[PDB]
Design an enzyme around this catalytic site. Structure first.
Site, PDB file in Angstrom:
ATOM      1  N   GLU A 113       0.847  -1.187   0.000  1.00 23.54           N
ATOM      2  CA  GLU A 113       0.000   0.000   0.000  1.00 23.54           C
ATOM      3  C   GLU A 113       0.882   1.237   0.000  1.00 23.54           C
ATOM      4  O   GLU A 113       1.828   1.329   0.784  1.00 23.54           O
ATOM      5  CB  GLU A 113      -0.895   0.031   1.240  1.00 23.54           C
ATOM      6  CG  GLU A 113      -1.741   1.294   1.350  1.00 23.54           C
ATOM      7  CD  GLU A 113      -2.506   1.387   2.661  1.00 23.54           C
ATOM      8  OE1 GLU A 113      -3.081   0.365   3.083  1.00 23.54           O
ATOM      9  OE2 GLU A 113      -2.545   2.484   3.262  1.00 23.54           O
ATOM     10  N   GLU A 118      -1.905  12.078   2.033  1.00 23.87           N
ATOM     11  CA  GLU A 118      -2.772  11.717   3.150  1.00 23.87           C
ATOM     12  C   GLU A 118      -2.524  12.597   4.377  1.00 23.87           C
ATOM     13  O   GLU A 118      -1.429  13.117   4.575  1.00 23.87           O
ATOM     14  CB  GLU A 118      -2.572  10.243   3.524  1.00 23.87           C
ATOM     15  CG  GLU A 118      -3.433   9.746   4.685  1.00 23.87           C
ATOM     16  CD  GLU A 118      -3.147   8.292   5.069  1.00 23.87           C
ATOM     17  OE1 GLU A 118      -1.996   7.846   4.879  1.00 23.87           O
ATOM     18  OE2 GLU A 118      -4.061   7.604   5.572  1.00 23.87           O
TER      19      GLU A 118
HETATM   20  O1  LIG Z   1       1.385   8.675  11.125  1.00 24.79           O
HETATM   21  C1  LIG Z   1       1.244   8.463  12.532  1.00 24.79           C
HETATM   22  C2  LIG Z   1      -0.192   8.036  12.846  1.00 24.79           C
HETATM   23  O2  LIG Z   1      -0.489   6.797  12.183  1.00 24.79           O
HETATM   24  C3  LIG Z   1      -1.853   6.406  12.407  1.00 24.79           C
HETATM   25  O3  LIG Z   1      -2.129   5.183  11.708  1.00 24.79           O
HETATM   26  C4  LIG Z   1      -2.693   5.453  10.417  1.00 24.79           C
HETATM   27  C5  LIG Z   1      -1.591   5.729   9.409  1.00 24.79           C
HETATM   28  O4  LIG Z   1      -0.855   6.897   9.799  1.00 24.79           O
HETATM   29  C6  LIG Z   1      -2.221   5.958   8.044  1.00 24.79           C
HETATM   30  O5  LIG Z   1      -1.183   6.110   7.063  1.00 24.79           O
HETATM   31  C7  LIG Z   1      -3.087   4.764   7.671  1.00 24.79           C
HETATM   32  O6  LIG Z   1      -3.743   5.025   6.420  1.00 24.79           O
HETATM   33  O7  LIG Z   1      -4.083   4.537   8.681  1.00 24.79           O
HETATM   34  C8  LIG Z   1      -3.461   4.231   9.938  1.00 24.79           C
HETATM   35  C9  LIG Z   1      -4.523   3.849  10.969  1.00 24.79           C
HETATM   36  O8  LIG Z   1      -5.411   4.952  11.173  1.00 24.79           O
HETATM   37  C10 LIG Z   1      -2.086   6.179  13.892  1.00 24.79           C
HETATM   38  O9  LIG Z   1      -3.449   5.792  14.116  1.00 24.79           O
HETATM   39  C11 LIG Z   1      -1.782   7.461  14.648  1.00 24.79           C
HETATM   40  O10 LIG Z   1      -1.934   7.238  16.057  1.00 24.79           O
HETATM   41  C12 LIG Z   1      -0.349   7.866  14.348  1.00 24.79           C
HETATM   42  O11 LIG Z   1      -0.054   9.105  15.009  1.00 24.79           O
HETATM   43  O1  LIG Z   2      -9.308  -1.029   2.045  1.00 23.27           O
HETATM   44  C1  LIG Z   2      -8.001  -1.579   2.106  1.00 23.27           C
HETATM   45  C2  LIG Z   2      -7.680  -2.069   3.503  1.00 23.27           C
HETATM   46  O2  LIG Z   2      -7.435  -0.899   4.316  1.00 23.27           O
HETATM   47  C3  LIG Z   2      -7.042  -1.229   5.658  1.00 23.27           C
HETATM   48  O3  LIG Z   2      -6.785  -0.046   6.339  1.00 23.27           O
HETATM   49  C4  LIG Z   2      -8.164  -2.006   6.356  1.00 23.27           C
HETATM   50  O4  LIG Z   2      -7.758  -2.357   7.670  1.00 23.27           O
HETATM   51  C5  LIG Z   2      -8.488  -3.271   5.552  1.00 23.27           C
HETATM   52  O5  LIG Z   2      -9.590  -3.952   6.134  1.00 23.27           O
HETATM   53  C6  LIG Z   2      -8.819  -2.901   4.105  1.00 23.27           C
HETATM   54  O6  LIG Z   2      -9.015  -4.081   3.339  1.00 23.27           O
END
Ligand SMILES: OC[C@H]1O[C@@H](O[C@H]2[C@H](O)[C@@H](O)[C@H](O)O[C@@H]2CO)[C@H](O)[C@@H](O)[C@@H]1O
Ligand SMILES: OC[C@H]1O[C@@H](O)[C@H](O)[C@@H](O)[C@@H]1O
Length: 296
Positions: A113, A118
């Site tokens: 990914e 973002e």
């Molecule tokens: O970047 C720090 C931040 O990460 C967060 O997790 C995110 C991630 O950053 C993002 O790229 C992805 O798409 O989703 C995850 C889960 O939400 C995390 O939750 C934060 O606490 C952290 O500060």
């Molecule tokens: O949508 C792509 C993927 O994103 C992730 O952040 C989720 O945890 C998965 O369940 C999902 O399949």
């Protein structure tokens, strides 16, 4: 590099994407709608030649959330250069979580990914992140951004759940508010069997071949983020990637960090805000000048 896929604009652009309507994987207070509904709600369309994709900033939310769209491309690419020229991107709006990214085929995160653009809420700087299966760490050099996490594994031992390996841009105009104030810019992402690189060219500073038919990343300025190094089998960690456009609300990131950031004063929690204040999300929209993918 040679062009392999030009997304065009307007309806021709949307014909190249599938509209995700399932419950938000990131559990956000969002209601992803179909193409027809989005079109009927002004959520998608064309604005003076630019492709528009936004959210509902008119009606109080209900059901599973504030209406938005999540587009995932029909075509996939595994090796290549993805170039997006934006005039506008979802703003630094409280409660929002916009993203332009790529997702591999198969079960996440085995196909890899790549989050090109973002951020959440009132963020100023963009985050470029990789999310992979276990066994993929990056080096700390070759880019202008600030490295936050070096382990791309979604469940990396020393990092927040699914933080992945992230690099934060140093240009405040690389995201949301600042990005829109300068009329946007360009994000070029290269995927090779040796790693991934992401360049951010703020409006007016893009090189002469970036939008052309034969761009050559080799002669460009240092990338904002670069993921490479012997700590990862770059080829095997990423397969065919499909492009994704979306704007969710609250959820796992934006919702979780709501109470500690600058939006905590807007309401007790994210959902209450997003639900009752539609007018706050007028800036949550993408405006694409062009989207082109190249291959070696
Ligand atoms: O970047 C720090 C931040 O990460 C967060 O997790 C995110 C991630 O950053 C993002 O790229 C992805 O798409 O989703 C995850 C889960 O939400 C995390 O939750 C934060 O606490 C952290 O500060
Ligand atoms: O949508 C792509 C993927 O994103 C992730 O952040 C989720 O945890 C998965 O369940 C999902 O399949």
């Amino acid at each position: 590099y040679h062009l392999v896929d030009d997304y065009g604009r307007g309806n021709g652009f949307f014909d190249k994407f599938n509209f995700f309507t399932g419950d938000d994987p990131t559990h956000g207070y969002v209601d992803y709608v179909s193409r027809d509904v989005a079109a009927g709600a002004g959520l998608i369309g064309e604005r003076d030649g630019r492709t528009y994709m936004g959210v509902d900033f008119t009606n109080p939310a209900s059901g599973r959330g504030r209406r938005s769209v999540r587009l995932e491309s029909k075509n996939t690419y595994e090796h290549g250069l993805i170039v997006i020229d934006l005039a506008h991107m979802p703003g630094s709006v409280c409660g929002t979580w916009p993203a332009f990214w790529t997702l591999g085929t198969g079960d996440w995160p085995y196909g890899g990914e790549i989050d090109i653009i973002e951020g959440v809420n009132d963020n100023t700087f963009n985050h470029m992140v990789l999310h992979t299966s276990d066994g993929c760490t990056i080096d700390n050099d070759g880019f202008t951004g600030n490295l936050k996490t070096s382990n791309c594994y979604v469940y990396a031992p020393g990092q927040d759940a699914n933080a992945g390996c992230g690099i934060e841009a140093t240009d405040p105009n690389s995201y949301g508010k600042g990005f829109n104030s300068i009329g946007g810019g360009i994000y070029a992402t290269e995927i090779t069997p040796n790693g991934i690189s992401i360049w951010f060219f703020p409006r007016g500073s893009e090189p002469g071949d970036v939008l052309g038919d034969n761009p050559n990343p080799a002669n460009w300025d240092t990338p904002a983020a670069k993921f490479a190094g012997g700590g990862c089998d770059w080829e095997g960690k990423f397969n065919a990637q499909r492009l994704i456009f979306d704007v969710t609300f609250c959820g796992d990131w934006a919702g979780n960090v709501w109470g500690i950031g600058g939006c905590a004063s807007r309401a007790a929690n994210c959902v209450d805000f997003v639900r009752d204040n539609p007018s706050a999300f007028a800036e949550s929209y993408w405006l694409v000048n062009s989207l082109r993918v190249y291959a070696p």
